[model samples]
Target: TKKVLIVEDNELNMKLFHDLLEAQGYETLQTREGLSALSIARENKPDLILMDIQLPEISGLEVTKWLKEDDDLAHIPVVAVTAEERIREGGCEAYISKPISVVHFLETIKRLLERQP
Candidate 1:
């Protein structure tokens, strides 16, 4: 099973993702703040990340920029799971809007994870 890290501040959204990903056989880890999300990602080295753009401490764009700069963590795919559609243009491997469809979300995750280095 693949490990997935989800960075979302909203409890409802977090729980929703937890249930959905867990149901799909993914080993899931979650953080409610952007700074912790970055810290956890560095330490855990999850296969993929589902990031919310409007985070409390740090923005998802900043987090993604940091991850891209980190040699040890840059290879892992980061997908923006945000309500802001404009954020999709900011270099994330893929972007899924809020109230994501289960089928489309899974397809996007799979495609990003399967990308060649």
Candidate 2:
């Protein structure tokens, strides 16, 4: 199963994505902070990342830039799961704003993950 690391400060959001990804046979790893997510990205190496813009310690954009700078992790897909509109025009592979449609969210994730590199 493909692993997806989700970075969300809110417990409710984390659990919702956990259930959503789990139900679809994706292994969901989660953290409440961008720094922790970055640490795990090095250690655990998930295939994709679901990043919330507002996070504890560091913003999601920082994590995205950090990963993109890293040679080893740069290729892994990062999706911005944010409340801001079109906030991820550059850093991430895709952007899905808050109040997301579950169907659309899943489709976006699948498309990015399955696409040729």
Candidate 1, poorest ten consecutive residues by summed lDDT = 82-91
lDDT, candidates in the order shown? 0.84, 0.86
How well is each residue in 57-86 modelled by candidate 2, as lDDT tens digits? 777887788888989889899999877334
- Report the number of the highest-TM-score candidate: 2
lDDT of 1 at 99: 77
Off by over 4 Å in 2: 84-86
RMSD (Cα, Å) of model 2: 1.8
Which segments of model 1 are wrong by more than 4 Å? 84-89, 114-117
> Model 1 over residues 11-81: C-alpha lDDT tens digits?
99999888988888889999998888779988888999999988877789988888888898888888898
Clash total of candidate 2: 0
